[PDB]
Design a protein around this ligand. Structure first.
Ligand SMILES: N[C@@H](CCC(=O)O)C(=O)O
Ligand SMILES: N[C@@H](CCC(=O)O)C(=O)O
Ligand code: NA
Ligand code: NA
Lengths: 264, 264
């Protein structure tokens, strides 16, 4: 075809490949302009899902797509690690948390998820894939009054997130070190699967093993042009589950949120 | 998976299988309830596009899908034929036209397409694939004040549509007997491609030959669960064009309308 975005994407990828930013080296503040350029294309409302799929599925786009996704994931992770440490050291930990680049979008996302999942105060939530800054975990208690167990696979990352939570004094948010298989030892009303919880198919296979058909499960994915940011969850990934509600994002929110229930 | 809609579809497919009628011979009034059942599923706003695709692409659905499509197309053509002749014989042609099952849906569909295509009074439109009841061509003139040419391949169907237009006393709608290739020698501001214009790949090929890059082209297609009604236009079909706007339907409107321009 002849979409003006094709060349815009290729020019971004050319700069990413050319600079070859290393996780340990990348200056997080210095590459924010690039993140904005990528998000400008991701968040563009005039691009329909058919066209997005046209572009992003093309064999000639594969290399460029892979560069953009790698940069986005690396930059997101680096921002989380930086913010986590800043919160731990801050004279004002909540103020510090609130100035996190993605904080406003997470409020918007979680409000839509809370409606989708009919969250009630006191309910027990598990969040799979906390990372260094377990922001959703934090908000589920601080805004929604839920009792939260966050699951994180990397021991040093899980410990950093404990320190974040302790530095904030958020009520009722615990961190369990391990993979999604630790949910067998937990009792919960709502389960949420982080956009970064991987590998998706194994994750959902394990969830299926341990949950019943009444448990509300929400997962985060990418649809439309926002799929430039990260690979979407596939239908095959959720075998054994039925979709029961979707929230498509608007504004600067990246994720699509999907409610599923386990099939009988 | 375990969608409730799956069993609902199989049930309709078995009622269709149950008929002794051949679909080109069925009584139109007697099968309206089956149409209603199919439309309830197609029009269900709770079914997300990913789930729809899950159900419709499924191997086990191949035959139920083809059967429901064959029924829907045969019914639609029969309703058109019957209505065209009824309008021709009526002492109140406009009243008769307004009683057409899909009439109010077309009012809504065209209103949205008029915004999508930026229609203006006195502009020239070509509609590819009129059939016996050239309702869109009629509305384009009578409501939107456009100067219309309708193209219809079958000589007797084309002649029937001329009689309908005359009976209604609508000015500014001509019918040309021919395929899409007739557009070579016409000057027009917008081209519209009927949902029924076939075969899509050849039709778009020819269009591409005879239009320039500034001409607004709108084609009608099916997305989401509404794909149960008829096969969608593929991206391969539109090679050489870019999408520049999409209207997804709500309510009981079946078609998705897509604005495209030819690529430089
Ligand atoms: N990953 C965070 C959200 C903030 C971020 O994306 O870095 C979470 O666990 O909710
Ligand atoms: N096919 C008609 C509309 C009526 C119908 O769908 O049967 C058209 O060209 O607009
Ligand atoms: Na996190
Ligand atoms: Na028609």
């Amino acid at each position: 075809s002849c979409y003006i975005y094709w060349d815009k994407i290729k020019r971004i990828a050319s700069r990413l490949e050319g600079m070859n930013y290393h996780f340990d080296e990348m200056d997080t503040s210095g590459v924010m302009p690039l993140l904005d350029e990528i998000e400008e294309i991701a968040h563009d409302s005039t691009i329909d899902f058919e066209s997005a799929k046209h572009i992003l599925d093309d064999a000639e786009m594969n290399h460029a797509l892979s560069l953009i996704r790698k940069f986005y994931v690396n930059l997101g992770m680096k921002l989380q690690m930086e913010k986590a440490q800043e919160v731990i050291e801050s004279d004002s930990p909540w103020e510090t948390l609130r100035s996190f680049y993605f904080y406003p979008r997470y409020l918007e996302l979680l409000k839509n998820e809370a409606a989708l999942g009919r969250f009630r105060r006191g309910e027990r939530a598990v969040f799979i894939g906390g990372g260094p800054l377990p922001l959703t975990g934090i908000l589920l208690s601080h805004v929604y009054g839920m009792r939260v167990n966050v699951v994180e696979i990397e021991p040093d990352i899980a410990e950093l997130s404990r320190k974040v939570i302790e530095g904030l004094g958020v009520d009722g948010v615990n961190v369990i070190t391990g993979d999604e298989t630790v949910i067998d030892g937990l009792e919960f009303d709502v389960l949420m699967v982080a956009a970064l919880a991987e590998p998706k198919r194994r994750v959902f296979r394990n969830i299926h093993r341990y949950v019943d058909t009444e448990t509300r499960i929400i997962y985060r994915t990418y649809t439309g042009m926002r799929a430039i940011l990260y690979a979407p969850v596939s239908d095959d990934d959720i075998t054994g589950f039925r979709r029961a509600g979707v929230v498509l994002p608007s504004g600067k929110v990246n994720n699509t949120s999907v409610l599923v229930f386990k099939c009988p």
